[PDB]
Design a protein around this ligand. Structure first.
Ligand SMILES: O=P(O)(O)OC[C@@H](O)CO
Lengths: 249, 249
């Protein structure tokens, strides 16, 4: 027994009206019979197109980031802007942002808290690098990530929160994450939640796997006890994303 | 016998569908008899609405930022995506970016050269901080900034470039630069261009002034030999912007 899964496509900084339209079409046409929440995270630019086109009842739209408040922040998009715009899902704290864009544990927590406050469903991303991993630091980093988020949230807030564990150590480093290793990272998070906030919250909490997921390994990943679905990059831009939705039965 | 001016509205991180639409109906209503190029820079999110609704022949839409290449940059939007969407103008190197999100002289330079290679018209911001000004480093600060950009550009490239002089201490404070302060800044930049690139280039280059420009102060500003228009934040959210447009011929 598990909560409702989530299949999240993070298109990243990719796209084209043409291509996406076509993908959208494949998605709407998809027959989805179980209870799963599908999420499409498009560039900020694509959002309008995406909303108009996605008619599938099991799909919602999400943005790939935001700043907490409007103002003099050239190039940035804030929560209010998104709220007025009918967007209610957000991806926050993604590792690419953590790495290139100065996103500390603190900035992430703030952004999350800010989002929860304003009503958004948040997919917050945590996860360790090969360095931290190699040095025996997996636990300290992950728990420190989740603890930083957690100091700005009340028990009630949790219902607005989804966690994505990103195996950074396995991303673009040449290493392979196995299902066992994913599961362990997940169980760990769940332990902290269950132990810090509460058992009820813990059982309801969705922990997505945010590593390498393809149509062939997604079911074996799903088959693990603390895997609640996926946050997807590469295969999200492909028809394969369809098998990934299915793998959550 | 000054190059065609520019009145650029920098919305920064602000707006709602309702409010921007109003501004747009306002702009669409306004008649401008002189050779002037007006620019609206809105949030990525609002590019759609802007492009569909803005009908005035003297206006163009702009993006407030971008990165050079598509790929795995969660939260970002590339040049390729913008060009696919109909956007050919872009504001780069804004101080708010340099300050908050770590955009160094090199990073900006890279973004400019790229943008220029993709056929965009680019408004590149340079300017000094309160601190630098008080130290007497102004001339050094600005020449270095411009020089970083010049490095990556070839002579013909310049036909696509616009420089915006935004003294940081003047950004959204009410502390406008006086005409003398803005004209000595603008002349300095242009003497470097003529010296380094060529007199022709300097003669054609547009150098914009930003920093607390408003309906009232715009005229005198513009009256300066080396002032070719403005790049406006706060006042661009108001009907006042209309008066700013009128001050520039
Ligand atoms: O006109 P302000 O004072 O809002 O500042 C404007 C610029 O920083 C944007 O180009």
């Amino acid at each position: 027994s598990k909560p409702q899964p989530i299949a999240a496509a993070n298109w990243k900084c990719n796209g084209s009206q043409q291509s996406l339209s076509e993908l959208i079409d494949l998605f709407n046409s998809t027959s989805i019979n179980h209870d799963v929440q599908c999420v499409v995270a498009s560039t900020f630019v694509h959002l309008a197109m995406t909303k108009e086109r996605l008619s599938h009842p099991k799909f919602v739209i999400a943005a790939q980031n935001a700043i907490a408040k409007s103002g003099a922040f050239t190039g940035e998009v804030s929560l209010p802007i998104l709220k007025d715009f009918g967007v209610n899902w957000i991806v926050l704290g993604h590792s690419e942002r953590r790495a290139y864009y100065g996103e500390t544990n603190e900035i992430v927590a703030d952004k999350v808290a800010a989002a929860v406050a304003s009503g958004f469903m948040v997919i917050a991303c945590i996860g360790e690098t090969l360095q931290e991993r190699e040095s025996g630091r997996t636990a300290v980093v992950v728990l420190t990530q989740i603890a930083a988020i957690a100091k700005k949230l009340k028990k009630a807030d949790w219902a607005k929160v989804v966690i994505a564990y990103e195996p950074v150590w396995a991303i673009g480093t040449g290493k392979v994450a196995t299902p066992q290793q994913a599961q362990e990272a997940h169980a760990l998070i769940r332990s902290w939640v269950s132990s810090k906030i509460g058992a009820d919250v813990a059982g309801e909490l969705r922990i997505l796997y945010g590593g390498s997921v393809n149509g062939k390994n997604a079911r074996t990943l799903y088959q693990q006890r603390d895997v609640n679905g996926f946050l997807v990059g590469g295969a999200s831009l492909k028809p394969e994303f369809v098998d990934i939705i299915k793998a959550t039965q």
